[PDB]
Design a protein around this ligand. Structure first.
Ligand SMILES: CCCNc1ncc(-c2nc3ccccc3s2)c(N[C@@H]2C[C@H](CO)[C@@H](O)[C@H]2O)n1
Length: 283
């Protein structure tokens, strides 16, 4: 990949501005131990991930390059270049005009609700990205709606490979509301990625965030339990900000999410079965 100067990126990101795009800054957010900044290089808008323990922060940079050097797919964010010459380590990506699936499900900044048709295409696209990672023996470890990006055509692009990668670990990492029971205990398995994807499918169907502090229940994965103990159905949870959803395809996506959400890691389907099921739903 392209080797950029730290000052070339510092110039295009206005000395790494930590303010939002809406006010007059460059910051896009923060996640996998790095801050995303909006820039403009080689006549194109870019995403700049400034990384930024002192050695642990460096390992987060070397992992993402090694995984992406191997990883080239239509459902993964494209790494254009990088920077190592400066104090902070940087990663350059293609700018995703439609931001995250999280922000689009919440209609952040007044954007129109995504239709069921777009939501199906996004689910299928995201599953194809995970499949590519799993085929190439990689575990994402942070599958969530904020890590699913959308391009100029609303194509799903999996981002953030800082945490990428059955093993055990003392450093438990990921997002609680999306985490499988075993991943919360320290296990490292691609079966944890399937569980997290089941939470994403529940967000797609319902339009509700995985965690909402002012909601009952606070965690979206607990809504799956309320439906199983037939107090309610998936139909009662369908996002109301849609006009094109039908019961058949919604129930078909919910079944996939339910299978993904088995608490027993070995009962869950593998990514290739997830793709098959999502493809049959459309078709
Ligand atoms: C309003 C237009 C937004 N456009 C946009 N385009 C590319 C990225 C990349 N972010 C990353 C992160 C890791 C690897 C590649 C990329 S490409 C991004 N990230 C922010 C920040 C956060 C991730 O930390 C996400 O949920 C997004 O909101 N936002």
């Amino acid at each position: 990949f392209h080797s950029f100067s730290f000052y070339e990126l510092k110039n295009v990101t206005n000395n790494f501005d930590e303010r939002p795009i809406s006010v007059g800054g460059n910051k896009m957010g923060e996640g996998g131990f790095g801050v995303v900044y909006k820039g403009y290089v080689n006549n194109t808008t870019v995403a700049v991930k400034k990384l930024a323990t002192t050695e642990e922060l460096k390992q987060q940079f070397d992992q993402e390059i090694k995984v992406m050097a191997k990883c080239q797919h239509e459902n993964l964010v494209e790494l254009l270049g990088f920077s190592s010459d400066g104090d902070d380590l940087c990663l350059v990506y293609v700018y995703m005009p439609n931001g995250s699936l999280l922000d689009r499900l919440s209609c952040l900044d007044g954007t129109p609700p995504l239709s069921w048709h777009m939501r199906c295409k996004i689910a299928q696209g995201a599953a194809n990205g995970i499949n590519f990672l799993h085929e190439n023996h990689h575990i994402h470890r942070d599958i969530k709606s904020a890590n699913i990006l959308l391009d100029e055509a609303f194509t799903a692009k999996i981002s953030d490979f800082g945490l990428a990668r059955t093993v055990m670990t003392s450093r438990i990492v990921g997002t609680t509301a999306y985490m499988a029971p075993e991943a919360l205990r320290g296990e490292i398995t691609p079966k944890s990625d399937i569980y997290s994807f089941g939470v994403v499918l529940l967000e797609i169907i319902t339009g509700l965030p995985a965690v909402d502090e002012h909601r009952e229940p606070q965690l979206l994965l607990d809504i799956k339990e309320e439906i199983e103990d037939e107090e309610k159905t998936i139909e009662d949870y369908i996002d109301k900000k849609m006009n094109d959803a039908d019961s058949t395809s919604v129930e078909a996506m919910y079944s996939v999410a339910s299978q993904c959400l088995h608490e027993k890691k070995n009962k869950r389907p593998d990514i290739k079965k997830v793709q098959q099921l999502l493809q049959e739903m459309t078709a």
